[PDB]
Write an enzyme that holds these catalytic residues in place. Structure first.
Site, PDB file in Angstrom:
ATOM      1  N   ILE A   1       4.636  -1.145   3.181  1.00 55.26           N
ATOM      2  CA  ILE A   1       4.293   0.228   2.851  1.00 55.26           C
ATOM      3  C   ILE A   1       5.167   0.652   1.685  1.00 55.26           C
ATOM      4  O   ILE A   1       6.383   0.449   1.697  1.00 55.26           O
ATOM      5  CB  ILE A   1       4.482   1.164   4.050  1.00 55.26           C
ATOM      6  CG1 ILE A   1       3.686   0.675   5.259  1.00 55.26           C
ATOM      7  CG2 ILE A   1       4.033   2.560   3.653  1.00 55.26           C
ATOM      8  CD1 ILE A   1       2.243   0.350   4.977  1.00 55.26           C
ATOM      9  N   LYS A   2       4.543   1.235   0.678  1.00 52.54           N
ATOM     10  CA  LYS A   2       5.196   1.602  -0.566  1.00 52.54           C
ATOM     11  C   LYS A   2       5.507   3.090  -0.526  1.00 52.54           C
ATOM     12  O   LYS A   2       4.628   3.918  -0.259  1.00 52.54           O
ATOM     13  CB  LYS A   2       4.269   1.218  -1.711  1.00 52.54           C
ATOM     14  CG  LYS A   2       4.744   1.514  -3.100  1.00 52.54           C
ATOM     15  CD  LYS A   2       4.069   0.489  -4.000  1.00 52.54           C
ATOM     16  CE  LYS A   2       4.053   0.860  -5.451  1.00 52.54           C
ATOM     17  NZ  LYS A   2       3.463  -0.280  -6.217  1.00 52.54           N
ATOM     18  N   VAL A   3       6.777   3.406  -0.754  1.00 52.73           N
ATOM     19  CA  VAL A   3       7.336   4.741  -0.589  1.00 52.73           C
ATOM     20  C   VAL A   3       8.141   5.078  -1.836  1.00 52.73           C
ATOM     21  O   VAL A   3       9.051   4.320  -2.198  1.00 52.73           O
ATOM     22  CB  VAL A   3       8.249   4.778   0.644  1.00 52.73           C
ATOM     23  CG1 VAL A   3       8.979   6.097   0.733  1.00 52.73           C
ATOM     24  CG2 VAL A   3       7.450   4.491   1.929  1.00 52.73           C
TER      25      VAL A   3
ATOM     26  N   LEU B   1       0.853  -1.186   0.000  1.00 51.61           N
ATOM     27  CA  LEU B   1       0.000   0.000   0.000  1.00 51.61           C
ATOM     28  C   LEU B   1       0.889   1.236   0.000  1.00 51.61           C
ATOM     29  O   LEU B   1       1.733   1.390   0.889  1.00 51.61           O
ATOM     30  CB  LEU B   1      -0.881   0.052   1.257  1.00 51.61           C
ATOM     31  CG  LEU B   1      -1.790   1.274   1.387  1.00 51.61           C
ATOM     32  CD1 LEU B   1      -2.790   1.335   0.250  1.00 51.61           C
ATOM     33  CD2 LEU B   1      -2.550   1.264   2.710  1.00 51.61           C
TER      34      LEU B   1
END
EC number: 2.2.1.2
Length: 352
Positions: free
Chosen positions: A138-140, A107
């Site tokens: 977590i997508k950064v 996400l």
């Protein structure tokens, strides 16, 4: 046929689905995929924009959330976090079976935070806690701020999908930040064996940017050459004594993940990117249509490390032509952030 997914697993590559929606999970389809060889799921703001717009199962959820005093962003997040948590539950058996090495769902944080390291850390910690599953990443975006945030998040024990990489130099900076976060945890006596990071290195966008102005012998070749060279860099970084000292203590290597692997130019076979980028300790996340094409007529062979000399020669000719792949990478990352923000604004408007 379908067994190609298990053949690729035997070559050391996981194939993830680059799509997520409420119906994908609720219908039982994702669960069946996770038995048939799919090993994870990625999302991004464009994926959610299309899912929210086209999946009938969101209508009742939106109507319910419009009865509450919530911002459009929190309506979106409630929907997206619910989809991700449900997908994580479907993928948990796979994840646990490998000791936490597979079965991830990603996400992405809000695009407006991409240049704000502290804000990114705050949102990523919050979304990690909101999803509340061990197999969520977590997508950064891999801006300079995102690499700052990566170090902090790793030191916090959070698994991260660092995205919008188009640059070998920036990818190496990401590995160094990861290693610093891991070293911090080891120095403090904290666990690292469950921390997993992928570096999502984008493919088709490079060829889309360059092909119309390249010579014949280079059209459709640059993105693959760049990925092959990135993988060589990966081998050299993670086998070096510096990282080996961390891996001996339980650290996991970052893994390269090939993204944007749907073919966008009809002049190239639809399985070009998947077929060409198979190697050990990697991931490829594919849209549905590309997954379909690969099952139907893809080929499982260890192609990623083949003909590395030719990849180097091609990148040398790209430079000879005056194409600076580092300048290009920065532009492509900028453009991808603008596009994701556009998609995010488009999905928020009906949630007002």
């Amino acid at each position: 046929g379908m067994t190609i997914l298990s053949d690729v697993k035997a070559l050391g590559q996981q194939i993830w689905l680059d799509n997520l929606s409420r119906s994908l999970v609720q219908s039982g389809e994702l669960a069946q995929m996770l038995k048939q060889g799919v090993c994870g799921v990625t999302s991004n703001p464009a994926i959610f924009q299309k899912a929210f717009a086209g999946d009938a199962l969101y209508a009742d959820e939106v109507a319910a959330l419009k009865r509450q005093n919530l911002s459009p962003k929190q309506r979106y997040e409630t929907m997206a976090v619910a989809d991700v948590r449900a997908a994580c539950d479907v993928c948990l058996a796979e994840h646990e079976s490998t000791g936490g090495k597979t079965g991830f769902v990603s996400l992405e944080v809000s695009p407006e935070l991409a240049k704000d390291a502290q804000g990114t850390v705050e949102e990523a910690r919050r979304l990690h806690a909101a999803i509340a599953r061990k197999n969520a990443m977590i997508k950064v975006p891999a801006t300079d701020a995102g690499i700052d945030a990566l170090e902090t998040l790793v030191s916090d024990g959070i698994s991260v999908n660092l995205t919008l990489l188009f640059s070998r130099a920036q990818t190496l900076k990401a590995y160094a930040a990861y290693a610093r976060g891991i070293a911090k945890r080891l120095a403090a006596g904290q666990s690292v064996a469950h921390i997993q990071v992928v570096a999502s290195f984008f493919i088709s966008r490079v060829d889309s940017a360059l092909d119309a102005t390249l010579p014949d012998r280079l059209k459709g070749k640059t993105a693959i050459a760049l990925a092959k060279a990135a993988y060589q860099d990966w081998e050299q970084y993670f086998t070096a004594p510096e990282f080996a000292a961390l891996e001996a203590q339980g650290a996991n290597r970052v893994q390269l993940l090939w993204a944007s692997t749907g073919v966008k130019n009809p002049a190239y076979p639809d399985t070009l990117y998947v077929d060409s980028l198979i190697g050990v300790h990697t991931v490829n996340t594919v849209p549905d249509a590309t997954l379909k094409a690969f099952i139907d007529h893809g080929t499982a062979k260890a192609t990623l490390t083949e003909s590395a000399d030719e990849a180097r020669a091609r990148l040398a000719e790209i430079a000879a032509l005056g194409i600076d792949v580092e300048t290009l990478a920065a532009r492509l990352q900028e453009d991808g952030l603008k596009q994701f923000e556009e998609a995010f604004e488009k999905l928020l408007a009906p949630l007002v």
